[PDB]
């Protein structure tokens, strides 16, 4: 009796043209048992093998036996909760050509899973086999194929039972294309065989073969998944079949891609039973997004958190040794004197202390003799602090010999310290704001000489990891007492700051840009330009004015100074990102807009400066100013004034248009209208009675119809249902209607369409439909229909000419007072986020006017990515370009045609600098050189200079000057610190003077990596890269721009990037170029962009480092008792919320491999919907409450996430 | 850049195929009554380019 | 009990607008022989 196929389900015949074949059926897992076993994270998931399968039986069924499909594509996965309806359908769009596609229509949305093309395009031509001695003898080394199985099912994806049948394999090596593995259907599988046209369970086994194929090595925290194939073929039923051909045409090596498969299905007899070709796995994004994301996983900053001391008092004898150190102020004694005195207090049991004040060069024998003194009979004395005290609050230009002298006496004393037979004591060290630690009491004024200590500290906590080398920042208003529990029983904390009375801490945080960070300016809308665009297209909050630099007119163009420009729903629809994109470039607000021309072109001649115009353009119409093209302007005839000019456009001129010169609307004729009261509703009345017309109506909720009616517009029916046309249709005796100025979509078009009698006029504006391929009933055409479609702003952009006919003439007519203007409700510009959302929710009535802000409303706006970078009329510095990075820099400068870079370095080139020099200068780049010491004052004015008296103005620098060099503690000598101090220090101070006055547009200081993080490599270049650290925080402070950039190493492998990436050059020059061209942009003052997550020297820093809140976070193995989550239900809901949100942060840890907070977003970091696709699944699994792939984009912040998540559980509680 | 008017009297996929072919503003004449009279499903879509479709028969209009 | 339905073929609900239902059903004395004896007019007919 039944034959359906199980899968497909029902086959139902259409006989409509194009013809279509529709299939139905329920894919659940309590149909199909086996189905459940692609768990994916734990949970139930269609494999692609069963698209795939679906298709060739679409295929056979079609175009019978032998017929097959090309360029395969898989769009969504699923989730198979119990019972899943699947409505996959074919079409004969055209003769010889079809299209098939599956997709879900529950939930009432749709969601295309896969496309499919399934023209037969096969002949008798029976495809030849495979030798099996051949294969079987090329590639016999075998391969724990089992094995690989298993530890791909724990790398994320299981494969149960049912989807066994891949078995133990064999290759050539590893890394190559000849896996030899076998497939038989597990028992549980042999038995219905005969309906599929080959299983689904063999088909995945076959391709899961790539996942042994790829590398079988795999690397840790990989994820994979089929996606499409380019063509397929079936050839005989699989039965019996033994192995898939192992073609594999991988571009591999990047991690991840493709792999562009073409697995052969061939029985034990060498013949081939099923062919596919072009198979690729995890496409991910474009390569934009590919550096896009390489920005996010490097990005680092000092996080500091506050917290409350855990130690309270333990361990007491508190007898550690302090030393008050270079203080040469008058009366630095009360700190020392107050902690020793609290030491003793406070301080239980014995806590004998003494003081070796070892002042800044007090004298030649207090290098050893002084120390000598209680460093040779009772040195190291369970514990030691030192002492710096306080210091002036702004740096002179000299000051910075006393930052030297205060590096020189801490290496000095600290390699005497370390220099103990026995176990070293934890070395604590007080500073007084020398750190600077976030918004709450930070900025400007910290002491600089103190700052370049913190480098060197942090290196040394690495280098002799024994004496623990926690240092603790001070503030006048934090009093000692907390200080002095933090001495006596600080708990395992390394950095941490006492700014207030408050105790803070600093963890090491991936930090990515977000819109806090955005270069901010101010702006003066009277002549200053700036535009209104949505940040987040989806959540219309985030609307933020942004800067526009009003650009003057060309030919052809006009500057006009808006002065009020109207919300329209194409408008509505760009904000909460639905618009239907179709050409790449997304629409700006705004379509319409009425000002003063403030500028003219150099070809048009219609209008002037000063005179009044009006009209539409692409390119955003909300902005104080707008340069649209002139042809594309109608000027204002002197009876309109801006008010009624920007009431009627775009509600005349579309009403006008659809009523008037397509419909030709004649005395009599009756009119329908759909949305009335709207604006276009409005003005389509006020034509109608203007020309002589019966003008029904339909309006929205029943206050709207009474009011319509108010009006006197008779006949108001309502629009939600389609119960109109029938009243319509009564009231008019069978002659419906003659015109439809339809505007709302679903069945309420059918009606409308066949409402009209005879004379036929259907114009159609509306958008949801057009774009939808609504698929019409074209029957009721028959009796002489005519069916318009209406969109201006496409009109306006194609036709310029007949929209501004059509401009002037609907103005002219609202002079002389035929027609009137709509009714107008202002609202302040700066006011669209709720302005949008009555239009949306349609509770005003009338054109939304906005008054865009002209006038001296100082104010900041928001420069975006498309920032100041390389302006042709200025010049630029860099420093030490002559070597190492500095070439490179400079050629980036060059390419991209800056104007004028100035090059200078502290000797003459060598002889391949001087060939790349001349090179780029034959490249087209007015690039001249100079020469002299940085440290010299005299060379930075001289360099300042000379960029400036060139006629071009300086704005730009980037002080790269560096030279590498590696010492340890013991060996670090003075010449070294100086000779790494004066480059860092006093080069950059004398820059920063010297071009203090210039109209700068940036300043890039360079660092390293190791004073963030700490390398023993080197510990003298840690110390002048974290003063220029703290000296940029302070410059920033003062307001000029400025941004300091921590570089780190090259290779994430380390030694191995030899054997598995090949001898490279340079730090990862390319990666960084694009790094430093977005990071010049924004705003943050200090940034580390190393390559870490994932990194050889990572696991030593999360061992000797007590914040190392990277953390590595390997327990993401969880099993099914993970489900007590739910039952943690138990516990109130708002809390159980509450920890909602720590199980989200850290079910996201793991899968972005960092500690993110609640706060920001999960794109931000970089998620290639398969970091999503992990998250989604496992807030299932861990919750049993599912969230759309869509409705987790608009709640893309944890917090929204986890209120989204409680709020669907208070639901079901309630239930 | 396509045809601009389409005096269609063709039937089947090859309307549909003149439909999608014309530019913006095309005005796609139609008097072919076969596949009117057929309730023909046409994919409304292509007139994304502000398209108008007539239809003309002369014996109903006199 | 079955699925289909002798009549009718198989159910299907195309959730077009407007949503339809759509059967494409088979008959005939060959495999519905129960059709043939009701031979009107001395032809085979549908009851």
Same mark, same amino acid.
């Given at each position: ?15 409509? %043209? ?21 768990? &994916? ?27 097959? !499909? ?6 969504? $996965? ?16 055209? *003769? ?184 690729? $796995? ?12 390489? !920005? ?14 855990? %130690? ?263 904000? +909460?990102?639905? +618009? ?13 807009? &009425? ?13 002037? &400066? ?91 909720? *029943? ?20 119960? +109109? ?183 003459? *080139? ?53 030279? &590498? ?19 860092? !220090? ?66 994430? !492998? ?15 020059? %390319? ?39 990277? +953390? ?8 099914? *008792? ?94």
């Amino acid at each position: 009796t039944i034959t359906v196929h199980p899968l497909l389900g029902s086959h139902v015949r259409l006989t409509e %043209e194009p013809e279509r074949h529709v299939w139905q059926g329920d894919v659940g897992t309590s149909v199909l048992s086996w189905l459940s076993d692609h768990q &994916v994270h734990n949970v139930a998931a269609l494999p692609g093998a069963a698209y795939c399968e679906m298709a060739l039986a679409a295929a056979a069924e079609v175009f019978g036996e032998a017929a097959e !499909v090309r360029d395969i594509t898989f769009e969504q $996965m699923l989730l198979l909760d119990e019972q899943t309806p699947i409505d996959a359908v074919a079409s004969i769009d055209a *003769p010889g050509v079809v299209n098939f596609t599956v997709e879900t229509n529950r939930d009432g949305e749709t969601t295309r899973h896969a496309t499919a093309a399934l023209r037969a395009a096969e002949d008798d031509c029976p495809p030849p086999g495979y030798d099996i001695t051949a294969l079987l003898q090329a590639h016999p080394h075998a391969v724990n194929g089992t094995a690989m199985r298993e530890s791909f099912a724990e790398r994320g994806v299981t494969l149960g039972a049912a989807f066994g049948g891949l078995t133990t394999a064999h290759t050539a090596e590893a890394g190559a294309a000849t896996v030899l593995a076998e497939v038989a259907l597990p028992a549980s599988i042999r038995f219905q065989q005969g309906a599929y046209r080959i299983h689904p369970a063999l088909l995945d086994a076959c391709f899961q073969s790539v996942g042994a194929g790829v590398q079988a090595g795999t690397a840790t925290g990989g994820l994979l998944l089929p996606l499409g194939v380019r063509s397929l073929r079936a050839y005989g039923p699989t039965r019996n079949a033994r192995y898939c051909y192992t073609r594999l045409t991988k571009a591999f090596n990047d991690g991840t891609r493709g792999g562009e498969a073409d697995l052969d299905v061939l029985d034990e007899h060498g013949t081939v039973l099923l062919a596919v070709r072009g198979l690729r $796995m995890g496409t991910g994004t474009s390569e934009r997004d590919e550096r896009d994301r390489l !920005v996010s996983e490097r990005l680092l900053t000092l996080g500091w958190q506050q917290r409350a001391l855990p %130690e309270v008092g333990d361990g007491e004898a508190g007898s550690w040794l302090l030393i008050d150190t270079s203080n040469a102020v008058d009366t630095p004694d009360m700190l020392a004197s107050t902690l020793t005195d609290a030491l003793k207090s406070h301080g239980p049991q014995g806590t004998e202390c003494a003081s070796l004040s070892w002042s800044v060069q007090d004298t030649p024998p207090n290098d050893q003799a002084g120390l000598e003194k209680l460093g040779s009979q009772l040195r190291g004395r369970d514990g030691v602090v030192i002492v710096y005290g306080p210091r002036v609050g702004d740096p002179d230009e000299h000051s910075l010999l006393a930052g030297r002298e205060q590096v020189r006496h801490l290496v000095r004393i600290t390699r005497e310290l370390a220099e103990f037979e026995g176990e070293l004591p934890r070395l604590f060290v007080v500073t007084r704001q020398a750190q600077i630690v976030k918004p709450h009491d930070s900025g400007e004024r910290a002491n600089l000489e103190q700052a370049g200590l913190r480098g060197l500290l942090r290196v040394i906590s690495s280098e002799h990891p024994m004496l623990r080398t926690t240092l603790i920042d001070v503030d006048e208003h934090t009093d000692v007492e907390r200080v002095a529990q933090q001495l006596l029983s600080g708990s395992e904390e390394d950095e941490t700051a006492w700014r207030n009375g408050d105790w803070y801490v600093a963890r090491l945080t991936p930090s990515p840009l977000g819109h806090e960070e955005r270069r901010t300016a101010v702006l003066d809308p009277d002549h200053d330009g700036m535009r209104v665009q949505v940040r987040r297209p989806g959540d219309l909050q985030t609307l933020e004015f942004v800067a526009s630099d009003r650009v003057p007119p060309g030919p052809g163009q006009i500057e006009v100074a808006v002065s009020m420009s109207s919300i329209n729903f194409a408008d509505v629809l760009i904000a +909460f990102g639905r +618009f239907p994109i179709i050409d790449d470039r997304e629409p700006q607000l705004g379509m319409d807009f &009425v000002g003063v021309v403030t500028a003219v072109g150099e070809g048009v001649t219609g209008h002037q &400066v000063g005179d009044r115009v009006g009209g539409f353009s692409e390119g955003g119409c909300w902005r104080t100013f707008l340069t649209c093209d002139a042809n594309l302007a109608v000027t204002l005839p002197p009876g309109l004034t801006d008010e009624q000019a920007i009431t009627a456009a775009t509600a005349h001129a579309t009403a006008w248009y659809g009523l008037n010169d397509l419909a030709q609307i004649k005395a009599g004729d009756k009119v329908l209208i759909h949305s009335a009261t709207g604006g276009v509703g409005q003005a389509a009345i006020s034509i109608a009675r203007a020309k002589g017309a019966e003008i029904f109506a339909t309006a929205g909720n *029943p206050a709207k119809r009474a009011m319509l009616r108010d009006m006197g517009v008779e006949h108001v029916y309502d629009s939600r249902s389609v119960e +109109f046309a029938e009243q319509i249709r009564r009231d008019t005796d069978g002659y419906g209607v003659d015109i439809v100025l339809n505007s709302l979509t679903g069945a309420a078009q059918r009606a409308g369409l066949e409402l009209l009698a005879f004379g036929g006029r259907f114009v159609e504006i509306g958008k949801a439909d057009v774009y939808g391929n609504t698929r019409l009933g074209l029957f009721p055409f028959r009796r002489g229909l005519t069916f318009y479609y209406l969109d201006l702003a496409l009109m306006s952009v194609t036709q310029p000419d007949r929209v501004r006919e059509l401009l002037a003439t609907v103005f002219k007519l609202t002079a002389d007072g035929v027609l009137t203007a709509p009714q107008c409700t202002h609202y302040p510009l700066a006011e669209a986020a709720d302005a949008i959302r009555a239009m949306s929710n349609a509770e005003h009535t009338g054109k939304l006017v906005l008054d865009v802000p002209r006038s001296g409303r100082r104010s900041v706006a928001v420069t975006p990515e498309q920032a100041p970078l390389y302006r042709r009329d200025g010049s630029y510095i860099i420093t030490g370009g002559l070597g190492g990075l500095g070439l490179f820099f400079a050629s980036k400068l060059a390419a991209a045609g800056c104007g004028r870079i100035v090059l200078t370095a502290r000797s003459q *080139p060598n002889p391949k600098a001087r060939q790349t020099i001349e090179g780029l200068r034959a490249a087209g780049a007015d690039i001249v050189v100079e020469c002299g010491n940085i440290a010299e004052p005299d060379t930075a004015d001289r360099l300042v200079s000379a960029a400036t008296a060139t006629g071009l103005p300086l704005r730009g620098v980037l002080h790269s000057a560096a030279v &590498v060099e590696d010492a340890t503690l013991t060996n670090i000598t003075d010449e070294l610190i100086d000779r790494d101090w004066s480059p860092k !220090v006093f080069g950059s101070w004398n820059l920063h003077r010297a071009t203090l006055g210039q109209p700068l547009d940036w300043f890039c200081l360079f660092s390293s990596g190791a004073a963030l993080l700490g390398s023993p490599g080197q510990g003298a270049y840690a110390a002048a890269n974290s003063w220029v650290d703290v000296f940029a925080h302070w410059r920033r402070a003062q307001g000029l721009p400025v941004s300091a950039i921590a570089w780190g190493a090259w290779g994430e !492998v380390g030694r191995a990037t030899f054997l598995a990436e090949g001898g490279e050059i340079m730090i990862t020059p %390319e990666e960084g170029a694009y790094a430093f061209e977005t990071l010049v942009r924004h705003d943050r003052a200090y940034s580390g962009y190393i390559p870490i997550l994932g990194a050889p020297w990572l696991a030593d820093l999360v061992r000797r480092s007590p914040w190392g809140e990277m +953390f590595a976070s390997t327990g993401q193995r969880s099993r099914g *008792p993970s489900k007590f989550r739910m039952e943690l239900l138990s516990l109130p809901q708002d809390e159980w919320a509450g920890r909602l949100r720590r199980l989200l942060v850290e079910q996201a840890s793991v899968i972005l491999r960092r500690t993110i907070d609640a706060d920001r977003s999960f794109i931000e970091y970089g998620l290639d919907s398969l970091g999503m696709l992990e998250m989604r699944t496992h807030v299932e699994t861990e919750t049993g409450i599912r969230l759309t792939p869509k409705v987790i984009a608009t709640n893309n912040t944890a917090r929204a996430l986890a209120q989204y998540l409680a709020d669907t559980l208070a639901e079901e509680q309630a239930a």
